Design a protein around this ligand. Structure first.
Ligand SMILES: N[C@@H](CCC(=O)O)C(=O)O
Ligand SMILES: N[C@@H](CCC(=O)O)C(=O)O
Ligand SMILES: N[C@@H](CCC(=O)O)C(=O)O
Ligand SMILES: N[C@@H](CCC(=O)O)C(=O)O
Ligand SMILES: [Ca+2]
Ligand SMILES: [Ca+2]
Ligand SMILES: [Ca+2]
Ligand SMILES: [Ca+2]
Ligand SMILES: [Mg+2]
Ligand SMILES: [Mg+2]
Ligand SMILES: [Mg+2]
Ligand SMILES: [Mg+2]
Lengths: 426, 426, 426, 426
């Protein structure tokens, strides 16, 4: 009489400290009833390593279970993708809380929201955009064409058109799609967002790219190193800081670089803490094949107007034809990859920046090397009590333990095996 | 309710010194906002060799990044090709400029536009057409049929019909399609265009042929030598010179050949500089398997009414039935292949011609051999200070360095490997 | 909005001395403009051997290039074939001329048209039909069925129905289709045509049979010997001669055979020159596996009412039921195959016939063996100054050189290899 | 605008002495013009053996060629078969004649028509039906099911339904379809026909069964022995003889068997000549694997009311429920297979019967063994001057020579090879 429909499922998700987005789903009809209670969640999930193992070193064994509470404003709805028979993608980001309503200290979305608050309190809005690079696997046709080339964009067939449309439907404001330097490498960028929404966007961009690829029988890889001796997949975070008003507070013509005193304090905090921030913005064992790629590199916490050997780069304005200038002025953090948790990573950066501003840190030998393995990066984080102290203590323990465990699971493992290993997790 | 559409992406492209067309794309809805700023671009991309490597010998490391500024008049729109599910091909050629509006010296489109200007200033319009030969791979059916044969055109199935239509839609004015001498070789020719548009056409003809082949599951090859011991793929440039008026200034009946004094000066400049022009019109290592094909050849800078052993050939008029005569009179430069950058190549030729005219060079032993390897061809370019001096100096450095590097990357490599190597890049 | 169409291409063709039809194509919209100028063509193409090689022994290197001038009356239009997605077949036969309008002496269509003229001048119309045999490869189903059998016609599926229809659309007047003696052998015959149109038909019948087979994923072979120890593929030319009026001038009841005095002169010229005509009507190296098939054969220039061991056969009238008689009276030349150029072959025959009539040659030991290899056949042609003299001298040189070269390319080569070799060219 | 149609071809056929049906076809539009002249045919085709070879022992080399003159009353039209895309089957049986109208003595249809005449002259109509058995190869599904079984009829899928319909459309009057004793064996029977039409039916039944199988991707085999150690494929001819009126003249109740004096004379002639008739009703080398199947058999010319070890069997009437009786009374000849020429075979039988009647031969040791090889069967035919004398002499020579030649081609060849050999020809 009528050909029946599959039920539309809605997911509640969280993106854990392992940079994985996880959740549970319910029939659409139930969404309203479900919104206030969210869905159950188990605290020990926050001790899962990329390899899906929990240690006994977790603080969370036994301990009473949590609620994953969807925030109604973060809803993503992609009604149609490449495959006309495929279910909508429908889900909401949530915060983790104890059963009474009590904000759970090891929740990475919550931490970022508290830090944005601390930002608001002293009059700063946070405006950010994550740029994402990935490998597109499975495409038909010839060997990959030249880097950056029209042919490489063409080889992708209907994928870029469907990707941008899926990201538009998902409310990401897609804006640029391009083939990048490596073989099968592409990049999609979106319009900036304020606060938490900016990290939600980073998650949405990843989860939707994955879903479009799935719908076409393709695969993506966001691992920092897609395969041995490949061009690496970065994530770059552009941050501007604005008076509760739209007035750009990072930027001041005629002061050199066009950087504010405020600006310089902010950048200085990020710089002084970078070797720690690496544990949180290049947080996996595979991250260090990207950060220290060739024999000795070392890689430093310095600044650039000029070059992209700099960990933090000033993105100067474009005058050219109309504009306007300064709204587009921002600072780009570069030692970041997609194995991160967008919320934890952005939170970590805005923190050290805050600490820069709070102690009116001056902008400078006054320059550290970034660590060279995850181990070294966790050493650094442990040594930076100023930064650690801004992190809710249970997060730090569960993070610090979970990562030791991640590196336990990976040790002895060749550089190559490790890269192949992670190219299967991101 | 409605089956959604993939977003239409518009690309901004540049064709680099490596003869590769590269760019970035945006959603159609944004095109208007995007036109004034263009899109970002990195100067160091102009040091990429055909093998996609940059040396430390580049002038562009560190240095501040550029804008790729689409010229609205060069837009290509192919709405439909062989595959009804395929995205339109939509893109615009752009010039590279520094962030304030400042014409970037290493931009090959810009250089050609400045040279056309220098042409206009002294009263000459430049009218040109590039003829393109290519291999069509993947066709079903028997062994390839006879050279030039109806059967060989038929074997191509729906490809020639879809090719001409795609080129028509792209505003190239396709005019001739034919099977050529080698197995799977075809040639498409188009109507001449004035100035920059003539080089844009050369790029458009290549990029669209590639896209039609892609849409049918076929492949093209434009490399100078498609495979070992194959008939070679040439590019021939027909140039006529006209008073700002349509009055042909190359041609004068009864003066022998029907060549003008002007004409002879022009041809003489091209001839005297040919061994240098080779570095810019046969600019890849694989180019010399085509220019000096058999054991000793050597190949010379001479002229022909008569034969195609001549590097520069007068294409006499066709009277026959109606006509008219002289508008169709032109000169064809022959040591050119598709590994070039249409704009750089045409610019280089019109330059030496200009120098011919400026020094009223007479038309003649007064005859040089064309070089025999890329190395020799770059030696020659370095030795021809008259020509070098017309090139913006940063272009020359970045070109000269990038090509050494290209030949570094290829050395020791057998003639055959080199040909197979390049048959994968063009 | 509208699903676009592939452009319809029109070809201009010539059938060269190698019996290959070659040309170039243009968009339909341009046909009118293009008709007066035709398209470019290179004289040296007339020195290509079946194996697609030109020697230095060609008269045409250097020499200025030609026009291929479509004759509007020879247009072939097949709008639809077996594959509904396939392009029309659209092309016109052309004559080759120098750039001013000047009939090029090495053009085989032109030579035949001049000979028909010489025929008209003395009051004779030439009426001819070529019968064609070929192999049809790729058919599904069992081993081939019995020679001449209903099952063999049935095995061909939709091919004969589509073949006749394609030939009807092409204006060939198809009339008979039949399975022949060899495995996968078929024959199609058409209604006779006058003069040049008769040779155009021979070309059209070949090119369309090929196109129908292509459209069905089948292949044809017209080589004199399709594969080792196979039944051979002949071409038979039926010629009648008529007063500028329809009055048959070959035929006279009661004179024996019903042959005219005129008739006997004509046949006598053909007979006296046959060993030369073989170089032009069995003109390839593979032709002699057909003409002298078994150990000693030798094969002679004699006549038959009676049998098909005769090189020239009188095809007597059919009374039976109605008729009428004499209009259908003709003479069939038999040592002919599809590796010929229909125009060159028919021209050559009508010539020797003319010479028969001009010298009132009587009809007779007065009997020669036909040569046994191409070499011997070219010896014979060189020795027959009477015939050579009617050929435009440049044709003869370019032909005579091109064929030496063909036999150079083939020598040492086994009988079998040679047959397999040619089964790939026709 | 309109999707064009393939041309409908009409064939003119003859069934040669080798039991193969051969012909040539023309476009439907031409059928009317073509009917009076028929189509050309070559006398030497009547010397082709089953293996498609002609000897020098043929009487027909040189000799002037013939007309195949379609008899308009024998037309077969099957407009639709299993494959909706397949051409109609359209053809007419013809008689062979010399070019003036003169009945050709070696034509098997003509001979049978002359014998039916000789029958009419003395007041007898000839009423006959051929029963045909065949193998159906290629069927999907399990091993073949039990002999005679519903499952075996079912395994044939849509074939029996399409076979009967095709035979109905062809005007054969199909009446029975059944699985038979051997694996993949089927039998179709039709209503009797008078005279020549009865043999045309036998040909039509074979050619259409073949065409239906072709349309479904199946194959048939009618060879006397389909494969080594298989149940054999017979052909049985039922003959009744009637006053020019419908009055059955074979049958007389109360005279024993219900056989007429006339009847007994007729049967007696068939019996006395059977060892010769075998050369014409079991006429191939493979026929003797069927006639003498096991070690010694020998097989005799005797009669049966009773059993099917008899070469000639009385088919008694069925009373049962209504009837009527005697119209259905007939005699069945059994040593016959599908390698015959229906017309030659039926002609041969009616002859010896005639000779029985003419010499009022009595019905009886008075009993011969049937030969055991083709050789012996041809010996017998040569020895029976009474029978030979009724055959047009040129038929006999061409037959007798063609078959020696057939057995030359097959000698040394194992029983099995021979069976496999012929299973490919019928
Ligand atoms: N793929 C580089 C970024 C290159 C670029 O986009 O400039 C990275 O790992 O960060
Ligand atoms: N394929 C030749 C051109 C031959 C021609 O079109 O005349 C080349 O490399 O330039
Ligand atoms: N296939 C034969 C012709 C046979 C025929 O049609 O009589 C030949 O080479 O000419
Ligand atoms: N297949 C048997 C006939 C069996 C029957 O139908 O009785 C034959 O060769 O005649
Ligand atoms: Ca490539
Ligand atoms: Ca995975
Ligand atoms: Ca071929
Ligand atoms: Ca067969
Ligand atoms: Mg990037
Ligand atoms: Mg060319
Ligand atoms: Mg024939
Ligand atoms: Mg039976």
């Amino acid at each position: 009489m009528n050909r029946l429909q599959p039920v539309r499922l809605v997911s509640f998700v969280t993106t854990d400290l392992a940079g994985i987005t996880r959740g549970r789903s319910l029939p659409l009809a139930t969404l309203e009833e479900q919104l206030a209670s969210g869905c159950g969640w188990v605290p020990a999930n926050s001790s899962l390593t990329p390899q899906d193992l929990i240690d006994e070193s977790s603080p969370w064994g036994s301990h009473g279970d949590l609620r994953l509470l969807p925030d109604p404003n973060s809803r993503v709805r992609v009604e149609q993708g490449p495959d006309a028979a495929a279910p909508a993608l429908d889900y909401l980001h949530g915060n983790l809380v104890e059963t009474d309503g009590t904000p759970w200290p090891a929740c990475p979305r919550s931490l970022l929201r508290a830090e944005v608050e601390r930002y608001r309190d002293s009059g700063l809005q946070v405006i950010a955009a994550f740029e994402h690079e990935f490998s597109l696997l499975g495409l038909p046709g010839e060997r990959p064409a030249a880097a950056f080339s029209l042919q490489a964009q063409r080889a992708a067939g209907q994928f870029p058109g469907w990707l941008v449309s899926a990201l538009a439907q998902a409310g990401t404001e897609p804006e640029m799609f391009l083939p990048e330097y490596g073989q099968r490498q592409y990049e999609v960028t979106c319009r900036p967002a304020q606060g938490v929404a900016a990290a939600d966007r980073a998650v949405n961009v990843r989860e939707v790219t994955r879903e479009v690829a799935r719908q076409m029988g393709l695969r993506t890889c966001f691992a920092p190193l897609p395969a041995p001796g490949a061009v690496t997949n970065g994530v770059h975070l552009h941050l501007s800081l604005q008076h509760a008003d739209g007035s750009p507070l990072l930027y001041e013509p005629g002061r050199p670089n066009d950087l504010s005193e405020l600006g310089e304090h902010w950048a200085a905090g990020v710089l002084a803490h970078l070797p720690a921030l690496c544990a949180l913005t290049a947080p996996t064992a595979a991250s260090y094949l990207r950060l220290k790629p060739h024999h000795w590199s070392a890689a430093y916490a310095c600044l650039g107007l000029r070059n992209r050997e700099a960990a933090l780069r000033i993105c100067p304005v474009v005058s050219v034809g109309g504009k306007p200038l300064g709204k587009q002025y921002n600072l780009e953090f570069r030692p970041m990859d997609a194995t991160t948790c967008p919320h934890l990573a952005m939170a970590a950066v805005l923190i050290a920046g805050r600490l820069g501003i709070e102690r009116r840190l001056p902008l400078r030998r006054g320059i550290q090397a970034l660590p060279a393995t995850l181990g070294d990066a966790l050493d650094c984080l442990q040594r930076d009590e100023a930064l650690c102290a801004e992190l809710p203590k249970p997060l730090l323990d569960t993070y610090l333990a979970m990562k030791r465990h991640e590196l336990a699971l990976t040790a002895g493992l060749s550089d190559d095996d490790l890269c192949r290993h992670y190219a299967e997790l991101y």
